Amino acid sequence: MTHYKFYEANVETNQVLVFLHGFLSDSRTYHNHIEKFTDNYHVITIDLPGHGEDQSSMDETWNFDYITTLLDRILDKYKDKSITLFGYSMGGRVALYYAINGHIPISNLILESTSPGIKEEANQLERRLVDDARAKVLDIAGIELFVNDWEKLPLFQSQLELPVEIQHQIRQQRLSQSPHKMAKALRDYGTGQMPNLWPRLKEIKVPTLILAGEYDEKFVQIAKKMANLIPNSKCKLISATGHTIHVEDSDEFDTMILGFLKEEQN
C-alpha cells in the first residue's frame, strides 16, 4: 500500500520503467521526469523502506532480501511486460541487488551514480561505523540538523550551484523524511550492510546503462569499473554534473534514458 505509483503510458506499450530513488529522498525526485517517459512508457515509482510514503514495519529488518521481496511483489503484476529497472545511488544499490537476486526477470537495467557496494572487509566496516554513527545522530538530533550537515558533504558540492528552487525542493524532500526511519534505512541497508556485489556483476546479462556525473570522480571511477564487468553495459559520463545527475541536468538525463530505451526496444 501507498509505497508505489503507476503512471499509465499515453499509448499502448509493453514497456514499464521502474524508478528507485536515493537515500533521504523519495519518488518525488522523479516528478518532473514522469511525463517525459509516459509519452511512450508505463512508469512506476517505488518508495524504498523508510522513505517517502513507504509503510514498511519498523519491526522488520529492511535488508536486501526484504527489499527484494518487496520489489518481487510489485513487479510480479508486470512480469509479462519488459521491465526496465532504474536505480539512483541508494536505489541503484537496490537495483543491482535486484538484477542479480530478484525473482522477476528484468529486461534492462539503468544505474545512476551508484555502486555494487564495498569490496574489502575493512572498508565495509569503516562504512558501517559511519552509517551507524549517522543513524545515531538521526535518532537523537533529528532531521533538520542531519540535513544541514548532509547538504555540506563534498559528494553534494555541485548542488550549491543549482537554482535556488531546485535546492529548496531537494532540502524539502530531505526534511520531510522521518529521521527514525532514515536511521533504520542506514542500519539495515546502508552500503556497509550490503553484500559486495562486485563479483556478481558479470551475472547481469540484460542491457545496462550506467550514468555517472563528471564532477563526481568517485562514482565515475565506480561507473567505469561496473561497465567493465557487466557484459552488455554502456557507460555515459554526464558533463558538468555531480552525483544527482537527474536533478542537475534533467534534460540530458532524460535524453540518455529515452535513447537507451529506444535502442533496446528489441
Residue numbers in the entry: 1 to 266
Task: Give verbatim lines from the article.
The enzyme crystallizes in the monoclinic space group C2 with one molecule in the asymmetric unit and diffraction data to better than 2 Å were measured in-house. At the end of the refinement there was continuous electron density for the entire polypeptide chain, residues 1-266, missing only the Gly-His residues that remain at the N-terminus following proteolytic cleavage of the histidine tag. Approximately 65% of the SaMenH residues are in well-defined elements of secondary structure. These comprise 7 β-strands and 11 α-helices arranged in the α/β hydrolase fold, a central β-sheet with a marked twist, sandwiched between α-helices. SaMenH behaves as a monomer in solution, as indicated by size-exclusion chromatography (data not shown). In SaMenH the main chain amides of Met90 and Phe23 are well placed to form the oxyanion hole; indeed a well-ordered water molecule is observed within hydrogen bonding distance of both nitrogen atoms in addition to the side chain of Ser89. There are six basic residues in the active site (Arg93, Arg127, Arg134, Arg174, Lys218 and the catalytic His243) and a single acidic residue, Asp131.
Menaquinone, vitamin K2, is a lipid soluble quinone used by bacteria for electron transport. We turn our attention now to MenH, the enzyme which catalyzes the third step in this pathway, a 2,5-elimination of pyruvate from 2-succinyl-5-enolpyruvyl-6-hydroxy-3-cyclohexadiene-1-carboxylate (SEPHCHC) to produce 2-succinyl-6-hydroxy-2,4-cyclohexadiene-1-carboxylate (SHCHC). The high-resolution crystal structure of SaMenH, an α/β hydrolase, has been determined and detailed comparisons carried out with proteins of related fold.
